[PDB]
Amino acid sequence: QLQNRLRSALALVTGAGSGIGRAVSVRLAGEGATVAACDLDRAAAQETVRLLPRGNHAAFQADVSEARAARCLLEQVQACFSRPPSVVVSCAGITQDEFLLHMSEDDWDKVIAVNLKGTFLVTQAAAQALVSNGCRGSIINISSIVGKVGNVGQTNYAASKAGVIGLTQTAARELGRHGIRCNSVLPGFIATPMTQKVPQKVVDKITEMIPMGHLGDPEDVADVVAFLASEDSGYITGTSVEVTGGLFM
Amino acid sequence: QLQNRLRSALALVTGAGSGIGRAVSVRLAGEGATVAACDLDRAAAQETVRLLNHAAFQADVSEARAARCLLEQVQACFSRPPSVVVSCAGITQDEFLLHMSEDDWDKVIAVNLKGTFLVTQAAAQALVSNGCRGSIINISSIVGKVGNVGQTNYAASKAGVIGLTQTAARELGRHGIRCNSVLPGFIATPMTQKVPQKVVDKITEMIPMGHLGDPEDVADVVAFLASEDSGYITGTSVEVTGGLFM
Amino acid sequence: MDKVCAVFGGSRGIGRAVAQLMARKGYRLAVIARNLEGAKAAAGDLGGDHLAFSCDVAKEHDVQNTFEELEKHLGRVNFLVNAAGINRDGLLVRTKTEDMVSQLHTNLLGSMLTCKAAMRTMIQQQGGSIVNVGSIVGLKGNSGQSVYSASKGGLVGFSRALAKEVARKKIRVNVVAPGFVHTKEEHLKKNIPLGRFGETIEVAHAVVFLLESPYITGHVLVVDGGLQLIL
Amino acid sequence: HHHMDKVCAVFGGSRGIGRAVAQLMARKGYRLAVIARNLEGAKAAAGDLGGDHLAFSCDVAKEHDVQNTFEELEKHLGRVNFLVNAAGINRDGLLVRTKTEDMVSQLHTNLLGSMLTCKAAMRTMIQQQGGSIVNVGSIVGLKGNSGQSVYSASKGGLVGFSRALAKEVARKKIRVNVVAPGFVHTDMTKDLKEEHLKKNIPLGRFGETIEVAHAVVFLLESPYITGHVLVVDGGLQLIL
Ligand SMILES: NC(=O)c1ccc[n+]([C@@H]2O[C@H](COP(=O)([O-])OP(=O)(O)OC[C@H]3O[C@@H](n4cnc5c(N)ncnc54)[C@H](OP(=O)(O)O)[C@@H]3O)[C@@H](O)[C@H]2O)c1
């Protein structure tokens, strides 16, 4: 339908081994973009690459919460494709839900390190790789609708996702005159392995709360990402796009 | 008059040693609230108390052990948990995204975001355990809403504070504990004296009121949020920017 | 630079609670509405020295002559409270244009007329404070309240546009955005974090706060009890 | 090919953003209805689009003109399941120097006009168990601007309205969204200091009509996005 929109584009996707990150990799490759699928689980990253003119797609393993892994990842992609990724998407995220009164220091620090610090490190390294090559780019950070309104049992998750928004807004302001756009995606509840960790009736209640009356599929997020990645959104930066089905609008 | 508005309240203020936190202490004590002035600086907190029974405390909010220790020191000195909790403890390590080191990111997040989490968590626990309702006030920033150049770590933390407080407000609503965020613009504080004068001039021109805010202006909203006059306000971000980035 | 406040729609609900609270604080109030009998009754229990006026804020000149009566009997109006509004729930398909225009001119255009007439006085005195009472549904929207949402969402951008325009003249304009105020809730009040509907006096305390805060303008103060987090 | 069951009604599609939205959707397979007060201008717009696309004359302020337009809309092209509200006027001026007539004018054109349009679209979108509406607002609509008071008010209500309508009809497979463009090169931003302004803007330039048009098309084709305000300002909202 609309391939070759990203024909001349290398796309780095962290957490591409499952769910949203996987659907993003499929959609990006579906429009012509060579995808560098990154994930903590290499077996999951390789599985994504298997479901996809120059060379081929590549699987990468990196812990985005580690500063060294965030650097080595970018360097290894540049080593593989002889160029920095024009499209960078951060789907690497985890949940460690607990009520505020009972949340341990580890449940907090881990979510922050991966979702917030992890996104920061990926954003920073990707930006540095684009500035040192004079290449334009589009950085897409997957936040959440939780990052705007907060949520029960997600003190650590909401704070991290909200931080991503304030982070992306700053990045967009600095990388603006460097030809690099920065945007955040704010998805509602999506049919991904993350929401399979939500009890069925809680999902039922959520479903009857979403105005559209159903959980969105990961392809819906990929649609937004593909748009933000292309030059169709060339005048869109520092923007938060909500794909929630009307939830918490 | 509002000098008896908070007569029955015990107020815990982190970062009360300087700037906003000190002005917060002044206003709260000026409304009859006995202030538990906390700060990383031992002498600054004591001098704050001197300007204001009142007591001074020292703690590093970024560390988990020092956070729960602080709340225990308060409940031991006053035989009660603080009904008012204000988190003004924050720092700034500005640098461009491309050139921001890991340490400059880790420290700002730990103090501003994680430090605020620990205090808010320990405060709620002390209030729920004693079955006492209250009001938790986290001092974020207008930067948390729109971001600012050279402040990726600062914007991320402040933005995280908002989502943090929003979550807390929704969980602590059943226990009568109100949680709100204050989003102040640029205010005449020692922190503002860190950024160069040339930039301060540009900002002042961008501010609709055409001048930097006073720390008393920020304390004015904190005093309101801490009062019963805002007894139906929770999970709300209050902006004191003079119209800056409305 | 005394303490004289004009509260439009101060005969009932929030505006009545605003007038009541500011009377206790020592302000000289003016209760303005269409039904003069309601305005007199409101300004009657408000203590003494408080005046009542009749005005349809949806009319360009009705508000004009009302302000010249304000200036004539109370003097310079330092504080403006736009709490006059109407609401008729209904689907957009089942809503005739007459009702659509009606709410627009009352809840939106009406506040624009009042804020405009208060300018030249507040401008010449280089001091003034305005609070426009809106709603949470004006920003987040609500089913069966489209027309009301538009009218209550409009004066959010208006108040802010006026704020950046008049801030250099030491004049502040803010918006109170209340949620569900008590003046059906069973399967709705349970959702709200505070577990109850608000009160008009609780919304009024927010209004007075915005009027007395020296460094706050173009701000939308939400009084919902955490409703906006789940709405 | 096949049946063109994707019909879009672009109000204010004679020039500027509406015309660009038109041009773009015409090549994507949508059948169009160029609508504006000036019939001569709307006719010329539909000419370069194709023979399948028709032009109609209407003033969104008048309820009957909208009603009669949608009547002729269906009886010539079919049922309307896509809607674009790019019809709007702007007049810069201080509130104290603003006529009440000028207030009612913008309020009826930009706000009330977009309400009547969505109202009439409900009939055709329910009769097809599906629809998508994009209301063109502004990044000034929620943030406000000195001199654009009435415009901010009219554009402000567009967000609360579209969201309230989104919740109201979401179960009928009808999505309502708002595009919030920044400074765009049209007849509206003719005498604006692009020099002194763009020094602040992150992208350092104004947006073109097709950049906003793509955003409109995006929202119309995003199946899990309703009641959302998409901002296309090049990062202006971080400074405004
Ligand atoms: N350009 C910008 O920078 C900018 C910024 C923010 C928002 N917008 C929005 O973008 C939209 C279009 O862009 P533009 O206005 O700048 O382009 P424009 O060249 O001004 O086009 C405006 C269109 O609206 C139509 N229109 C005006 N009044 C109408 C009425 N009463 N009834 C029916 N149609 C009417 C006009 O048709 P006629 O020939 O019949 O008048 C014209 O085709 C506007 O609605 C505006 O709100 C633009």
Instruction: Give the list of residues 6+ apart from residue C70 with CB closer than 8 angstroms, or none.
Output: C6, C30, C53, C77
Which of D122, D157, D163 shows the shortest C-beta gap to C108? D157
**In testing the pocket of ligand 1, which one of D10, D15, D68 has its CB within 8 Å of the most ligand atoms?**
D15
First-residue to last-residue Cα distance in chain A? 31
Whether ligand 1 lies within 6 angstroms of the CB of D38 is answered as yes
The response to whether residue D234 sits with its C-beta less than 6 Å from ligand 1 reads no
- Token match 């720390």: residue? B215
Residue D11's DSSP bridge partners are D35, D85
Catalytic-labelled residue, pool A157, A180, A220, A230: A157
D86 Cα to the center of ligand 1, angstroms: 6
Q: Pick from B176, B180, B183: which is nearest to B167 by CA?
A: B180
Instruction: List all residues 6 or more positions away from D183 whose beta carbon is below 8 Å from its beta carbon.
Output: D189, D192, D194, D197, D198, D201, D206, D207, D233, D236
Q: Name the residue with the closest Cα to ligand 1, atom 19.
A: D16
**Which two tokens mark A118?**
């992890």
| Cβ-Cβ contacts under 8 Å for A95 (sequence gap 6 or more) | A111, A154, A157, A194, A197
Q: Facing residues of C178 across strands? A: C223
Angle, helices A19-30 vs A218-229, to 10°: value is: 50
**For the stretch C145-161, what's the b/e string if a residue is b when 16 or more beta carbons lie within 10 angstroms of its beta carbon?**
bbbbbbbbbbbbbbbbb
The two three-digit tokens of residue B82, written as one number: 């603080």
Longest C-alpha distance within chain A, in Å? Answer: 54
CB contact burial B95-128 (16+ within 10 A = b; e otherwise): eebbebeeebbbebbbbbbbbbbbbbbbbbbbbb
Q: Which of C146, C153, C162 sits opposite D168 (nearest CB)?
A: C146
Q: How far apart are CA A86 and CA B245, in angstroms?
A: 31
In contact, A161 and A114? CB cutoff 8 Å? no
Host H or E run for residue A102: none
d(CA A66, CA A121): 8
DSSP state of A244: S
Q: Would strands D131-136 and D82-85 be described as parallel, antiparallel, or unpaired?
A: parallel
With 0-12 CB in 10 A as exposed, 13-18 as middle and 19+ as buried, what is A46?
middle
Assess contact for D125 and C118: CB atoms under 8 A: no
Closest in A173, A235, A243 to D224, CB measured: A243
Partners of D33 in the beta sheet?
D9, D54
The SS3 of residue B103 is helix
C-alpha Rg value of chain A to the nearest Å: 17
Contact B232, B34 (CB under 8 A): no
Find residue B165's DSSP bridge partners.
none
What residues of chain B, 204 to 223, have a C-beta less than 8 Å from chain C?
208-210, 213-214, 217-218, 220-221
**Cα D37 to middle of ligand 1, angstroms:** 11
Matching residue, tokens 């020296």: C214
C contacts of D147 (beta carbons < 8 Å): 165
DSSP code, position B33: P
Tell me the one-letter amino acid at C63: V
- DSSP bridge partners of C221: C176
Q: Distance between CA atoms of A42 and A20, rounded to whole angstroms?
A: 16
CA C69, C72, C73, C78 torsion: positive or negative? positive
The closest alpha carbon to C174, from C150, C206, C210, belongs to C210
**C-beta of residue D122 within 8 angstroms of C-beta of residue D165:** no
Best of D10, D14, D40 to mutate for ligand 1, by most ligand atoms within 8 A of CB?
Answer: D14
Inspect the interface and report whether the beta carbons of C223 and B236 lie closer than 8 Å.
Answer: yes
Please report which helix (H) or strand (E) contains residue B34, including its range. Answer: strand B34-39
Cβ contact C179:C152 at 8 Å: no
Angle at C62 between CA C60 and CA C66, to 5 degrees: 120
Query: Cα distance from D48 to chain C (closest Cα, Å)?
Result: 35
Helices (H), chain B: 19-29, 42-51, 64-77, 102-108, 115-129, 143-146, 152-171, 197-206, 215-226
DSSP of chain C: ---EEEEET-SSHHHHHHHHHHHHHT-EEEEEES-HHHHHHHHHSS-SS-EEEE--TTSTTHHHHHHHHHHHHT-S--EEEE---------STT--HHHHHHHIIIIIIHHHHHHHHTHHHHHHTT-EEEEEE--THHHH--TT-HHHHHHHHHHHHHHHHHHHHHGGGTEEEEEEEE-SB----HHHHTTSTTSS-B-HHHHHHHHHHHHH-TT--S-EEEESSSGGGT-
Q: Which of D156, D160, D163 sits opposite C158 (nearest CB)?
A: D156
| A188 SS3 class | coil
Top CATH class of A1-249 equals: alpha beta
Q: Cβ separation of A246 and D231 shorter than 8 Å? A: no
Tell how far CA A69 is from the center of its chain: 17
CA A169/CA C197 separation, integer angstroms:
36
For the record, the structure tokens of A138 come out as 């589009």
DSSP D118-129: HHHHHHHHHTTT
Distances (CA, A) of D10 to B184, D118, D202: 42, 12, 30
Q: Round to whole Å and give the CA distance between A221 and A211.
A: 17
D137 C-alpha to center of ligand 1: Å? Answer: 11
The residue range of the domain holding D42 is 1-240
- What is the rounded (10 degree) CA torsion for B18, B21, B22, B28? 180
Inter-helix orientation angle B19-29/B215-226, to 10°: 50
- If we measure between CA atoms, which residue out of D11, D178, D6 comes closest to residue D82? D6
> Which residue among D10, D37, D58 has the greatest number of ligand 1 atoms within 8 angstroms of its CB, and so is best to mutate?
D37
Number of C-beta neighbours around residue D97 at 10 A: 10
Q: How many angstroms is the resolution?
A: 2.3
- For chains B and D, count residue pairs whose Cβ atoms are closer than 8 Å: 9
Question: Contact, A21 vs A92, CB < 8 A?
Answer: yes
Interacting residues of B76 by C-beta distance below 8 A, sequence separation 6+: none
Burial B53-68 (b: 16+ CB within 10 A, else e): ebbbbbbbbbbbebbb
Task: Identify residue A246 by its one-letter amino acid code.
Answer: G
DSSP string covering D168-216: HHGGGTEEEEEEEE-SBSSSTTSSS-HHHHHTTSTTSSPBPHHHHHHHH
Domain CATH for D177: 3.40.50.720
- What DSSP letter does each residue of A118-181 carry, written as one string? HHHHHHHHHHHHHHTTT--EEEEEE--THHHH--TTBHHHHHHHHHHHHHHHHHHHHSGGGTEE
Indicate left, alpha or beta for A19 from its phi (over 0: left) and psi (-120 to 50: alpha): left
Number of domains in chain C: 1
Give distance in angstroms: CA of D38 to centre of ligand 1.
12
Chains touching chain D through at least 3 C-beta pairs below 8 angstroms are A, B, C
> Any idea what the Cα angle at residue C36 is, between residues C32 and C39, rounded to 5°?
50
Rounded to an integer, what distance in angstroms lies between the CA atom of residue A82 and that of residue A78? 5
Distance of CA B84 to the CA centre of its chain: 11
Residue A231 CB burial class (10 angstroms; 0-12, 13-18, ≥19): middle
Q: What is the DSSP letter of B246?
A: -
Helix (H, G, I), strand (E, B) or coil at B52: coil
Strand, coil or helix: B199: helix
Provide the 8-state DSSP code for A232. Answer: G
Give SS3 for A94. coil
Distance C58 CA to ligand 1 centre (A): 27
Do C218 and B209 count as a contact with CB atoms less than 8 A apart? no
Q: Which fold has domain B1-246?
A: Rossmann fold (3.40.50)
CB C92 within 8 A of CB D123: no
Identity of the residue numbered A32 = G
CA dihedral C124, C125, C127, C128 (to 10 degrees): -80
Q: If contacts are CB pairs under 8 Å, which of residues 189-228 in chain C contact chain D?
A: 218
Closest residue on chain B to D235 (Cα)? B146
| Chain C residue numbers touching A249 (CB-CB < 8 A) | 140-141
CB A70 within 8 A of CB A88: no
- C87 has a chain A CB within 8 A of its CB: no
Q: Is the minimum CB–CB distance between A152 and chain C shorter than 8 Å?
A: no
Q: Please judge whether C225 and B224 are an interchain contact, meaning their C-beta atoms are less than 8 angstroms apart.
A: no
d(CA B61, CA B83): 18
Q: Residue D19 CA: which ligand 1 atom is closest? A: 43
The nearest CA of chain A is from the CA of C137 a distance in Å of 11
Q: Distance between CA C7 and CA C57 in Å, rounded? A: 12
Q: Beta partners for B10?
A: B34
Mutation test of the interface with chain A: which of B60, B127, B154, B164, choosing the one with the most A Cβ atoms within 10 A?
A: B164
Q: What is the 3-state secondary structure (H, E, C) of B53-82?
A: CCEEEECCCCCHHHHHHHHHHHHHHCCCCC
List phi, psi (to 5°) of A102. -120, -5
Asked if residues A118 and B156 have their Cβ atoms less than 8 Å apart, the reply is no
The tally of CA atoms less than 13 A away on the side-chain side of residue C140 is 21
Which of A131, A174, A237 to mutate against chain B (most B CBs within 10 Å)?
Answer: A174
Single out the catalytic residue among C8, C79, C148, C158: C148
Q: Tell me how far apart the terminal alpha carbons of chain C are, to the nearest angstrom.
A: 41
Partners of residue D181 on adjacent β-strands: D232
What's the rounded Cα separation, in Å, for the pair A137 and A9?
9
**Computed from CA positions of residues D58, D59, D63, D65, in that sequence, does the dihedral angle turn out positive or negative?**
negative
Does residue C144 belong to the interface with chain D, where contact is any CB pair within 8 Å? yes
Q: Are D147 and D92 in contact (CB under 8 A)?
A: yes
In the numeric block, the tokens 């801030």 are attached to: C167
The 8 Å CB, 24+ separation contacts for D204-209 are: D204/A176, D204/A177, D205/D234, D206/D182, D206/D234, D207/A235, D207/D181, D207/D182, D207/D183, D207/D232, D207/D233, D207/D234, D208/A235, D208/D20, D208/D184, D209/D16, D209/D17, D209/D19, D209/D20, D209/D184, D209/D185
Interface test with A, best of C140, C143, C229 (most A CBs within 10 A): C229
Could you tell me which residues come within 8 angstroms of residue B224 by beta carbon, excluding any fewer than 6 positions away?
Answer: B230, C209, C213
Distance of CA A225 to the CA centre of its chain: 9
* Ligand 1 near D14 CB (within 6 A): yes
Distance from residue D84's CA to the centre of ligand 1 (Å): 12
Q: In angstroms, what is the C-alpha Rg of chain B? A: 17
Annotated binding site of A: 12-20, 39-40, 62-64, 144, 157-161, 190-192
Q: Residues 6 or more apart from D80 whose CB is under 8 A from it?
A: D7, D8, D9, D33, D70, D73, D74, D121, D124, D125, D131
**Residue B156 annotated in ligand binding:** yes
Distance between CA atoms of residues C201 and C184, nearest Å: 21
List the one residue out of B174, B157, B88, B67 whose CA is nearest residue A99: B174
SS3 assignment, position A13? strand
Of D75, D73, D57, nearest in space to D65 by CA: D57
Q: Are C140 and C93 in contact (CB under 8 A)?
A: no
Helix (H, G, I), strand (E, B) or coil at B187: strand
State both tokens at D34. Answer: 């160029």
List the one residue out of B93, B137, B91, B86 whose CA is nearest residue B111: B91
User: DSSP readout, chain D?
Assistant: ------EEEEET-SSTHHHHHHHHHHHTT-EEEEEES-HHHHHHHHHTT-SS-EEEE--TTSHHHHHHHHHHHHHHH----EEEE-------B-GGG--HHHHHHHIIIIIIHHHHHHHHHHHHHHTTT-EEEEEE--SHHHH--TTBHHHHHHHHHHHHHHHHHHHHHGGGTEEEEEEEE-SBSSSTTSSS-HHHHHTTSTTSSPBPHHHHHHHHHHHHT-TT--S-EEEESSSGGGT-
Q: Residue B4: left if φ>0, alpha if ψ -120 to 50, beta else—which one? A: alpha
CB contact under 8 A, C215 and B240: yes
DSSP B213: B
Q: Which of D14, D17, D89, D102 most suits a substitution to test ligand 1, by most atoms within 8 Å of the C-beta?
A: D17
Which residues is C100 bridged to in the sheet?
A: none
Short-list B140, B115, B138, CA closest to B61: B115
Assess whether C148 carries a catalytic annotation.
Answer: yes
Decide if D60 contacts D114 (C-beta within 8 A): yes
Q: Does residue D87 have a known ligand-binding role?
A: yes
Query: What are the φ and ψ backbone dihedral angles of C82, each rounded to 5 degrees?
Result: -90, 90
